[PDB]
From a paper:
Among these, Cullin-RING E3 ubiquitin ligases (CRLs) stand out as multi-subunit complexes comprising the Cullin scaffold subunit, an adapter subunit, a substrate receptor subunit, as well as an E2-recruiting subunit RBX1/22,3. The ubiquitin ligase function of CRL3s is activated through dimerization.
The overall shape of CRL3KLHL22 dimer resembles the letter ‘Z’ when projected from the top. Two CUL3-RBX1-KLHL22 protomers present in a symmetric unit forming a homodimeric assembly with an overall dimension of 220 × 120 × 120 Å. We found that the CUL3 NA motif, together with the CUL3 CR1 domain, tightly wraps the KLHL22. The CR1 domain interacts with the BTB domain of KLHL22 over a wide area mainly through polar interactions. The hydrophobic residues of the CUL3 NA motif, such as Met23, Phe21, Ile18, and Met16, project onto a hydrophobic surface of KLHL22 formed by Leu161, Phe162, Leu158, and Val155. Furthermore, our structure of dimeric CRL3KLHL22 reveals that the dynamics of dimeric assembly leads CRL3KLHL22 to a transition between a compact conformation and a relaxed conformation, which gives CRL3KLHL22 a variable ubiquitination zone.
Author numbering:
A (entry chain D): 14 to 174, 176 to 225, 227 to 282, 284 to 331, 336 to 397, 404 to 459, 464 to 482
B (entry chain L), C (entry chain K): 24 to 147, 149 to 178
D (entry chain C): 14 to 174, 176 to 225, 227 to 282, 284 to 331, 336 to 397, 404 to 426, 428, 430 to 459, ...
């Protein structure tokens, strides 16, 4: 292509913005009062285009800020002041909705400003300007903000105690969030902090009231309360609130006085002899969220197990003693299999206690070796008790005494063959399993050698 | 589940709309640009650009009006922009520029702005003063810095 | 000259159309499927499929009617196919099949037929007889040959 | 996913297909009479949808063919037949347009058949079915077709004569194309063949007519004729007819008697002595399209050059002879530079004639050698005619032009040459033995000058 262009006779040197402004300001006034049915959008946008070419967008800017703030000073501020105690919040949300639709229309008809002034001069958009001017004029008034906060706080308390409106509090919550532009600063400083603090006070009062001298009812109703709180927050309040509230709940409702509710004489850990799966399971599952919470239940469990081992091991009939050892072991592992979720820390503390008292008595190994001797004096069931019997062996640190006695008993259970089944007599070695085995096998396998 | 997304459907719909326009049936909005009537689909001409969005769906008086007034633009430019909206193809020649550029600045469609900027890029050292004047008036950053780079290359 | 063609424009236009539908503004046609009203754009629902092309732009009595009675489709199927037309994404689950399949045949939209065929491809050696009956009834060659291949693999 | 499907409780078998076929046929009949403002589209499609689903596609196809052909027998056939001589080709175009829109609507409401029955039974679409039934029923009738042929032929003939409505013929001409499905068989056998035949006959009457005994007027008016024909075809006829009609024009109007229009005593190649660029340029550009056409003018001008060459060679003053050679050469190369487009065959044949007679003279090299000597007895003009003088040099086959050396003495010893410096340049123009023997004697006079 070898054609000249030379086709740019363009000039916008016409000073009449005053006229295009006064008209645009009348248009904004009409939109503020909801008379949009009779304004020519194309002509309104044309007025907007001319000012952009004339570079009088600043006049439109300052003028737009002035007109929106004037409409907010008059016919919004005292519009909600005059209803401060009468049908409040609803009027605030209504005014907010009308303002939102008005600013949507204003951005729609002045959209050029949002494309070459707002973008190229590092200033807030028309929609964001409306949101900011609402946040600075209607809310954070000093009287509107105080009343708005109290109404939300009082309503959420009556709901916590009565039935109140849930749609309005949700609308206000959403308005407070969207008033923070991208963030939630308005939410944080307007409703989040007072609601959190009043909830802390209410839950501390409830904490002092709940302690009434019961555990199962207390823990179940605390579960009901926290479930109610999370349900309410997900229903009415906004989602980002659901994290800090629940934490505060578990900071004030149970972890505030966790140590005094684990043990109380009249009601769950103290009397675990009931053996109810739900009774301890609910208490565990409700103390699981609190950090360090597992430690106090572990300590109570450990104290009880220590006392039981001291009481039972301290001599006594040779077989009923080991029967007590195994039956207590079975009962205690029952809890960890059906009450808890087989928590590693709990298993560790039971193992530690079992390693404490079982080895505390020096006769234990002798009794453990006798167990088999009494046992050897259905066959599948006997195999099952071997697994339970093999559990203690791992716990003993003095297995030398056990194997030495087991070898002494090995002779007594061999020479006259007190063992009912010979084939199993190898199986217990297989469970027990060289010197731990050969010395127990040298005597027996000799009786196999001389049997030919 | 696994939702299935088809890519060819959008262009298929565009060709279907083009065929519908060519058949000239189901027209709803008619624009008078400079005394010349151009007919177009209201909803199609409502999702193309923000200006038309605030026009056919803003809520102003312009809704309940069959005939609308589109001034400050040239009939050739309006036909060109409607053609772009209807088939995503912009035929740019020497004649249809500086009226397509002002119309594109009007309707605030970034695609037409970029296409016009490229066209003036191709045909840009004899008439740079008036092009710079136009770019400064309509405030296109890309055109300005490309013009500065071209001056640097000079 | 050189004509500039943009590919992102079609997807942008569909996104804007979805936004307009979500805002619920500029609706013109309303469909009564089974006593349930579903509102949609006439021209948008005029170039998606040939069935709707003949309905809205054919020239029959159905043109000058705000409310249109459509049968042979379930409300869930109608909503699913409208969603596909508006955003080119088809969410297919167990419930919305054998109702979306017939709906796709009703509008004769090849894309939905292929998508339903693929969904039946994924979930097909316990209920092959009824699937074969359905495929023979609606006469899909692709589904039939896929079923034959699956029987061969058995 | 591990969920059972088990959600196909479908059953549709019924013999109510004929009852709803009655409704569909009534609807189609109503659409035939253009009462589509009151027919429920979805219900009509539903009828077709069920009709197809119960595998009754053949019944629906047979019924549709029957109803469309019944509407073509009544209210189309005699509709145009009753207007056979009154406003024909307008009533038929209206009938075709009404049928086209009717079949568009019928395909629109019966579209299911076009998707799973037509495609899976290897049959023609509903639109193509309507087109075929129109092609078989209202045209190709034997009376409607024959009258259509007369009307189109007479119209285009009157246009060549008078003013006719090309637009009307365009409608019928295009309808004829679209009636051939993808191809143009109906066009070929209905209007193309008679039109071309009439054009041939008319152009042969014209060809025997215009031969009136003139060439420039004849050739210009023939150019006007072909330009009219190509524009006429493009404007009123279809775009696949321009090629055959153009070939028939160039075959029958000028190539029929091309050999007799190239020479006529009263008027272009015969009397080319006029030298008019347009006079011969038009004839060239109008015989250029015909294959073998350039040969007749090549031979005619070759014969003229031979006759001129023989007389020119026939000797005579030594200078005027070569002057005649040069200016005849200039005049004839003028034609190839400004009348023709420097055609390769033309240049070759002029070169051939020049090679023929320029050496048909034994004394020609003697005269050629004398020229320089007479010339040597502005300086830029001297160089120019040297280039022209060189042109004949290459044409001589008897350069063994010894005489340049025989003359070399007589333009050296007493130095008859005006400029010595150019006397070397003509050697470079002439350019070893062809030059050294011409240089040995001259450069010796340079040797003794010190």
């Amino acid at each position: 292509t070898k054609m000249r262009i030379r086709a740019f006779p363009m000039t916008m040197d016409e000073k009449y913005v005053n006229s295009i402004w006064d008209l645009l300001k009348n248009a904004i006034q009409e939109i503020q009062r909801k008379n949009n049915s009779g304004l020519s959008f194309e002509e309104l946008y044309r007025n907007a285009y001319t000012m952009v070419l004339h570079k009088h967008g600043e006049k439109l800017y300052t003028g737009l800020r002035e007109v929106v703030t004037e409409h907010l000073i008059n016919k919004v501020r005292e519009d909600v002041l005059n209803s401060l105690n009468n049908n409040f919040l609803q009027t605030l949300n209504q005014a907010w909705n009308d303002h939102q639709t008005a600013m949507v229309m204003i951005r729609d008809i002045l959209m050029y400003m949002d494309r070459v002034y707002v973008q190229q001069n590092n200033v807030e958009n028309v929609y964001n300007l409306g949101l900011i001017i609402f946040r600075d004029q209607v809310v954070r008034y000093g009287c509107i903000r105080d009343h708005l906060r109290q109404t939300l706080l009082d309503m959420i308390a009556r709901e916590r105690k009565e039935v109140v409106d849930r749609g309005a509090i949700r609308n206000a919550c959403q308005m407070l969030m969207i008033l923070g532009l991208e963030g939630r600063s308005v939410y944080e400083e307007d409703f989040e902090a007072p609601f959190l603090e009043m909830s802390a006070e209410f839950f501390q009062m409830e904490s002092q009231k709940f302690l009434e001298n019961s555990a199962s009812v207390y823990i179940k109703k605390v579960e009901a309360r926290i479930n109610e709180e999370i349900e309410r927050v997900m229903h009415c309040l906004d989602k980002s609130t659901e994290e800090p509230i629940v934490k505060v709940v578990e900071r004030e409702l149970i972890s505030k006085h966790m140590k005094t509710i684990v043990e109380m004489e009249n009601s769950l850990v103290h009397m675990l002899k009931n053996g109810k799966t739900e009774d301890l399971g609910c208490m565990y599952k409700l103390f699981s969220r609190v950090p360090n919470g597992l430690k106090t239940m572990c300590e109570c469990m450990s104290s009880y197990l220590r006392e039981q081992g001291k009481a039972l091991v301290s001599e006594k009939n040779p077989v009923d003693y080991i029967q007590g050892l195994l039956d207590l072991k079975s009962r205690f592992d029952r809890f960890l299999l059906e009450s808890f979720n087989n928590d590693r820390l709990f298993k560790q503390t039971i193992a530690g206690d079992f390693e404490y008292f079982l080895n505390l008595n020096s006769r234990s190994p002798e009794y453990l070796s006798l167990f088999i001797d009494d046992k050897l004096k259905t066959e599948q069931e006997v195999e099952t008790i071997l697994d339970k019997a093999m559990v203690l062996f791992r716990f003993m640190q003095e297995k030398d005494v056990f194997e030495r006695y087991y070898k002494q008993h090995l002779a007594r259970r061999l020479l006259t063959n007190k063992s009912v089944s010979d084939d199993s007599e190898k199986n217990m070695i297989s469970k027990l399993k060289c010197q731990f085995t050969s010395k127990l096998e040298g005597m027996f396998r000799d009786m196999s050698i001389s049997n030919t | 589940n696994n939702t299935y997304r088809s890519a060819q459907h959008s262009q298929a719909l565009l060709r279907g709309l083009l065929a519908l326009r060519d058949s000239g049936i189901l027209f709803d909005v008619v624009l008078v640009v400079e005394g010349r009537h151009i007919e177009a689909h209201r909803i199609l001409l409502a999702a193309s650009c923000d200006y038309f969005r605030g026009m056919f769906a803003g809520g102003l008086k312009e809704m309940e009006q069959e005939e609308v007034l589109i001034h400050g633009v040239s009939y050739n430019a309006m036909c060109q922009i409607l053609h772009f909206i209807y088939t995503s193809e912009l035929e740019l020649s020497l004649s249809n520029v500086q009226e397509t550029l002002v119309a594109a600045c009007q309707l605030q469609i970034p695609e037409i702005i970029h296409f016009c900027c490229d066209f003036l890029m191709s045909w840009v050292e004899e008439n740079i003063l008036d092009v710079y004047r136009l770019a400064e008036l309509f405030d296109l950053s890309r055109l300005t810095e490309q013009l500065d780079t071209y001056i640097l290359k000079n």
